[PDB]
Amino acid sequence: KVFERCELARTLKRLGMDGYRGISLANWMCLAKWESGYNTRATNYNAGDRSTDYGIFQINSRYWCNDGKNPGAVNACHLSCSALLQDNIADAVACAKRVVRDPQGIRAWVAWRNRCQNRDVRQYVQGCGV
């Protein structure tokens, strides 16, 4: 499913992401924008290591979910990757909290460093009143 920006922002809002481990709603949104366009079914094959990034937050399969492919990957969020392609985004988000529980936090996403760090993020929340 494709969210309207502010729908997402408020849903994340409702699910406890604002300020979770220090990350504001706005950061999460910028992240979401560059990684998925607010689309739960977004995929990406990483030709580099054959991994595959899933859903609205483009969680990677090598370490965060299980998709059956690489027999040496880990699934730290203990969910099938497919549960990251659905309309309800609680799993995504939970898994998203777990990744930002790593010490690097949201800087684990490359797109967050290139697109949001030390840049304008309010924009992604402007008018959502969250």
**Positions that interact with Cl ion (CB under 5 A):** 51, 61-62, 70, 73
19: phi then psi, degrees, rounded to nearest 5: 80, 0
CB of 101 to Cl ion, least distance (A): 21
75 vs 86, beta carbon nearer Cl ion: 75
Q: Single out the catalytic residue among 4, 7, 18, 35.
A: 35
Active-site residue 53, yes or no? yes
Q: Single out the catalytic residue among 53, 67, 91, 120.
A: 53
CB of 53 to Cl ion, least distance (A): 10
6: phi then psi, degrees, rounded to nearest 5: -75, -30
Active-site residue 67, yes or no? no
d(CA 53, CA 3): 19
**C-alpha separations of 125 from 34, 60, 74, 88, 112 in Å:** 14, 26, 34, 21, 16
Active-site annotation, residues: 35, 53
